[PDB]
Structure formats: C-alpha cells, structure tokens
Amino acid sequence: GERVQLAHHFSEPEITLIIFGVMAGVIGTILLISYGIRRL
C-alpha cells in the first residue's frame, strides 16, 4: 500500500480470495436451499 500499514497474516490477494470463496459458498448454499424448496 502506502506509508506504513499494519502487517496481517494473510496478504491482500489471499484475504480477497478467502472472502470471495466464502461469498461463493454462501451463494451456493442459498441456491441449493432454494432448489430444495418448491419440490417436496
């Protein structure tokens, strides 16, 4: 970044990949739940 930034365990690509993976998992869970409804 710029100036002095706090050091984190995960770098920016790593943390954004983790966040995108969590978001994709939540979206997939919601879609699968909706697929479960309206069938039984």
Binding site: G1, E2, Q5, L6, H8, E12, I19, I27, L31, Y35
Partner: protein, 517 residues
Amino acid sequence: PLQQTGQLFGGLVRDIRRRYPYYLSDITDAFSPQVLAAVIFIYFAALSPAITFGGLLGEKTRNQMGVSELLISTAVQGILFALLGAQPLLVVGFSGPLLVFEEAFFSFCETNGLEYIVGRVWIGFWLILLVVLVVAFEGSFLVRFISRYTQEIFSFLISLIFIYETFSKLIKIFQDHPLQKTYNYNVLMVPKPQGPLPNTALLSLVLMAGTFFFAMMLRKFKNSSYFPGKLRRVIGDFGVPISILIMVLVDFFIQDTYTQKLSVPDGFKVSNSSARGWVIHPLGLRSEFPIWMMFASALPALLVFILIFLESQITTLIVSKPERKMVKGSGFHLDLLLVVGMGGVAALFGMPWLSATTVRSVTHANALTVMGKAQIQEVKEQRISGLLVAVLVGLSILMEPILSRIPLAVLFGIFLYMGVTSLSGIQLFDRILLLFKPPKYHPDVPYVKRVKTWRMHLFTGIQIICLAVLWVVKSTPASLALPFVLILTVPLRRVLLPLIFRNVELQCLDADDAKAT
C-alpha cells in the same frame, strides 16, 4: 423482458440471448457523424459532473477518494458496460444520493474511529452478495410495477434537481465575485482567487447564456428548412459541439478577464498518497478492522443496492420506452448485475461505485435519436459511443491542455440545455403545460379527449404534491430516504388512485405505451 421465467438466473440468460445476437450491428451502426457528435456531447456531459463530484469527494473525505479515482472508475465501468451491457445507450456514473451516502458513512466512521475506505470495501463485498441473489431469483422483475406514473415523476424531479444545481453553481460563482464599485487589483490566484474580481461573474453569465442560446438555435436549425438537408442534419447533430467550440473560442480571445476552468489531477495517482494506495486491505490499513463492522455493513450495503437498483432500472425503463422506437431490446438483469459487480470490484481498488444516471443516459438516448419527416424514426443503438466516451474520460488526464482552457460556464449552458431537452418524452411536463392552456388548445390525445379537463388537472396536481414532498425530502438531512418515498408512489397508483379515478381514466392517464386504453 420483465417476465419472470422461474429459472435460476433466468433473466440474465435471456438478456444475453436478446442482445448479443445484435453485437455485430452494435458496432456497424456507429458509422455516422451523429455518433461522433453524441460522443463529443456525452464526454463533457459525464466528465464535468465527474470532476465536480470528485473534487467534492476529496474535500469531504480528506482526499481518501478524489477526482482521479472517480475518473478511473467511471472510465472502467463505462468501457465494461458498453462492451457487455445489453443497453449501450445508458451512461453509468456518480450520482447525488451516492455522494450523500458517502458523506454520511464518512461521518459515521469518523465518529466511531473506523477506517472509511475499508468500510467501503466491506460494503462493496456485501454489494456483490446482494446482486447475485437478486439476479438468480430474477428480483429485477419487480420493476414492472413501476408504471409511467413513477417513472415520469422521478424523471421530472431529477430534471428539476439538475436545473436547480446548474443555476446554483452560477449563483455560487456570482456570490464569489459580487459586483463592487472598487476592487483589489492584487489578489492571489493559486489555487483559486482569494478575492472578488472585476468582470468575472458577468462574463461567466454571458458565456452560459450564449452557450444555451447557440445550442437551442442549432437544435431549432436541425428542424428548420434552411441549407441542404444533408448539411442541415450534419450541422444540427453537431449543434452542442459547435456551440461549445464557439464559446471556448470566445473565451480564448479574451485574455484579461479570468474564468474558472476545468481542473484535472496531474497524473494517474491517488489523491492522498499518504492515506491509501491502489489496493486497500480488507483487514485494515492502519488499525485492525473490527469484526462486527464487517457484518454490520449489510444495512448500508442494502441502502446502496436499493439506490443503485432504483436509479438503474428506472433509467433503463425511461430510455427504453416503446414510444422511443427501441427495436433492439434492453436487459435489466444484465445491466444491474454488471453495474453492481463493477462497483463492488472497484471498491476493492478504493474507487467509488456508480449507477446508471438518469440525465446522462437520457441525453445519450436523445442525442442518438433520428427524427422523421416531429416523429421519432430510429435510434443509433451502438456500443461504440459509450466505449469512446469512457476512453476519453480515462484519457482526460492526458489531454489536460485541451480541458484547461474550457470554462465551466459553457458546461453550465450545456447542462441547462440537457435539463430542458430531457423533458420531451415526459407526459407529466406536457400535462403541467396544460394547466396554463385553454381546453380547446389541448392536443388530441387519449388522456385529453377521454378525460375531463378538471379531472386531468386534479390528476396532474396529485403528482405535484408528490413532487413537492420529494423536494422537501431532498432539502432535509434524511435525503437517503428519497428512494423509499419514490417507492411509496406505487401503492398510491395501485391502491389510492382507483378510489378516486375510474379504470378507463387510469388507462388513459397512465398508459405503458401511450395507447387509447
């Protein structure tokens, strides 16, 4: 296009198959000087509000986000929206409610001692979550309940706000340089003049008035019967560029009198190099970002999604009315998905999110319209114009000497022209003019020949109350509730209006395609 298929991502897939077959036509249809004239129009029409909003954002956020970030975000979003969106006539850019939300969120973060840009990153992260569910479940099908009533009320209110801000900038300029009997000839000018100057505000007013006059005269000359028809159409299409060039030359031939000019950042760099870089860490830059605020960002994310969704869908409805001869189709699910996703991604780069602005997209649709031998004949639907506008916005930093000699007064006259020409397609403004006309001079339309004059006046005055209420909300700190008050008009149309009006009267006054019931 507004039908609900019931399949996951059903609207997104159909919008792809509706427009992408016309991708070859979306490039070949731009081979005309009218497309270039529209490019020159929309370039300034999107750049000047972008520059103003970037300056205000830098002032109000301590330069965490400024002119350069907004310019880069606007260029990227315009390029990707023109290349991939199903409605290439839309213009995506910053809006007023977005600025109000950013001001409120910056104040909230300052009060709580939290990092503002990381909060924006997390809100944009939750923005991507919201849009995918809406697109998957076809949540963009609710806009079919937004009839001509709400669309025209929103368009009229937005045009009124546009004209009011255009006049307010001139009023502020006049206040900055009041007409005095004596002046101090030794006034510092960098970065802005620190005192009143002679002939400045008056020359700005003259430039604005001349710009508006020349633009209107050339627009009338397009419909006139002078000069050869091909040359007449060519001159009329370039009416705004010709007027802008004329007023720029007029100001350039005047050296002594100072006029405020367009200002852009020197290079492609962040506004505050000591605050943040091009990439902002979601975990915190200076301090560890709190865990609770990551989840608590959903409600501001919900507000931002509501704002963007309403603005973009209403703009797409307005630019794609059946009376405007849109014979290529529009995609509500694809455009919304692209806009919200680009905003969420650009939040990670420290850039503001955007929305399909009403005024700029309405002007872009109207600038591309070709009239018949009074009657709309066809519209030059193509993706080249928006792509070129976004490219020129991105390159506006590199062409500073061209922009550095352009006064804002010319842009003020252009904005007034856009505001007064954005009302052609609104029946609400037409009926407001009928409030000052005798009944025998009313046009032969279904809502006049089948509705009593006092009934039509009452129906028009009902909307005037709604317009006044919306204007009051804008003039209050809680101006972020404006979309909710706008949504409340739909229950008024579907519930309260039938209690006082008949079905035939409602069909005549509010027709989705301007038909005789």
